Amino acid sequence: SAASLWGPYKDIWHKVGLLDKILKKHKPDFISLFKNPPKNVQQHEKVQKASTEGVGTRLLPEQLIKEAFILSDLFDIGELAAVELLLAGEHQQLVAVLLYWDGKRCIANSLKALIQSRRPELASMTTRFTGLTYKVLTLVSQIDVNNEFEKLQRERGLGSEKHRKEVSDLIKECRQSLAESLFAWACQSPLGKEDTLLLIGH
């Protein structure tokens, strides 16, 4: 499972820039994606009960439930994960949206830092499962999905530009950081002809 908090990611990055092997060790988070949990129906009943449990459990008031549903509908995301996100970040509104993006931003930056900066046990650790390399292409996809546009179309007659500029911004940054990771991989060459062909196609 992946910790769905921004904080461990933020602190770890701060260590670099100290690197503690322990925190870094629970590495799989640097998947860069949220492929496994998308919005789930099964999770909605769980949340609706007002009792929610993560992979302790906590009571859920109505106000929180609304923020949580806003997240899942807004970004096709699992309802419980969405809650972990609200919990981690100070509850103010929505904050949950922030943690969602900050968590991703940090992960990407760290991967970028490692792949580019170090020349190494850790880089070997990160790449070794690869796996990051499998994921890099998918990560550029996904940012691609134009759910935002669909929302925009539905919105017409009503209009929430600002919330969108905010998301479009986080994504562009993600693409940009994604660029650095790919480049870094090339400098730290992965093996053969297949990747190039795949990328050329993508």
Taking the C-alpha atoms of residue 24 and residue 28, their distance in angstroms, rounded to an integer, is 9
Amino acid at 120: P
Take residue 43 and report the two structure tokens written for it.
């999770």
Take residue 152 and report the two structure tokens written for it.
């925009």
**Which of 28, 33, 25, 199 minimizes the C-alpha distance to 130?**
28
- Give the number of other CB atoms < 10 A from CB of residue 36: 10
Taking the C-alpha atoms of residue 3 and residue 134, their distance in angstroms, rounded to an integer, is 21
Q: Is 19 exposed, middle or buried (0-12, 13-18, 19+ CB in 10 A)?
A: middle
**In this structure, are strands 58-59 and 51-52 parallel, antiparallel, or unpaired?**
antiparallel
With tokens 């990055």, the residue in question is 13
Q: Phi and psi at residue 77, in whole multiples of 5°?
A: -120, 155
Q: 43, 79 in Cβ contact below 8 A?
A: yes
Residue 40 falls in which region: left (phi positive, over 0), alpha (psi -120 to 50) or beta: beta
Three-class SS of the chain: CCCCCCHHHHHHHHHCCCCCHHHHHCHHHCCCCCCCCCCCCHHHHHHHCCEECCCCCEECCHHHHHHHHHHHHHHCCCHHHHHHHHHHCCCCCCHHHHHHHHHHHHHHHHHHHHHHHCCCHHHHHHHHCCCHHHHHHHHHHHHCCCHHHHHHHHHCCCCCHHHHHHHHHHHHHHHHHHHHHHHHHHHCCCCCHHHHHHHHHC
Q: 145, 175 in Cβ contact below 8 A?
A: no
- C-alpha separations of 124 from 71, 112, 121, 129 in Å: 36, 14, 5, 9
Amino acid at 165: K
